[PDB]
């Protein structure tokens, strides 16, 4: 799966402005950009507070947090049945593809995915903190 590139010619939804939007964090640290395809002009609710009309086609919306991107994407998926994907954008122009890392949503199991953080024992079989005294590691890290 080849990640898509972030096009800079994608029109944004019709929005009248809000006090909940990009702030100094967006210009010093990072922000996010969500893109989705819509079949018709319909009203959705902005995750930052308000309402907007999505374009009849490609859309491009700037967010300040990843959680807002997931909220808008979940509403789009379960309400408008719209596929979406977002990116993390840095002040230096670096764009990172985020949500469908392999093109398939995380709810569906996909081959080629590595098991990270999986422990091969029961949760109650953890080592006691006393045995790991003065060792710079945690019981769950074993």
């Amino acid at each position: 799966f080849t990640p898509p590139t972030l096009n800079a010619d994608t029109p944004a939804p019709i929005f009248g402005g809000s006090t909940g939007g990009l702030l100094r964090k967006a210009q010093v640290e990072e922000f996010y950009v969500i893109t989705w395809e819509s079949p018709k002009e319909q009203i959705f609710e902005m995750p930052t507070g308000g309402a907007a009309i999505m374009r009849s086609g490609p859309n491009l919306l700037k967010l300040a947090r990843k959680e807002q991107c997931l909220a808008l994407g979940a509403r789009l998926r379960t309400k408008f049945k719209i596929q979406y994907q977002f990116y993390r954008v840095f002040p230096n122009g670096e764009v990172q593809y985020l949500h469908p890392k392999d093109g398939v949503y995380p709810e569906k199991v996909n081959a080629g995915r590595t098991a990270v953080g999986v422990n091969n024992r029961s949760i109650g079989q953890n080592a006691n903190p006393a045995e790991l005294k003065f060792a710079h590691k945690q019981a769950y890290d074993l």
Partner: protein, 95 residues
Amino acid sequence: KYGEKSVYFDLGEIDNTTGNWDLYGNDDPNRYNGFQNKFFETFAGAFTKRGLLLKFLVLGGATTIGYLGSTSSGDLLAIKNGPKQAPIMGPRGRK
């Protein structure tokens, strides 16, 4: 382009994209005419930061307040005026 269409995201213009604008930052350089005196008289503060200005401020606040508290007269400051009436004396005859 940022303003060519309804697009508001552009990697070539990240300051416009992120809203890093200066709303009232006028850059007109002609404000004052006679300012040689102000440059001349201000050498202890400018381009000193932690070395000269801070030490001078600490010394001139400590010495200033010490002098004021040590040389204040009775009328201006009541704590240094001292008691004037007789002791009120406490209960059970304890003094």
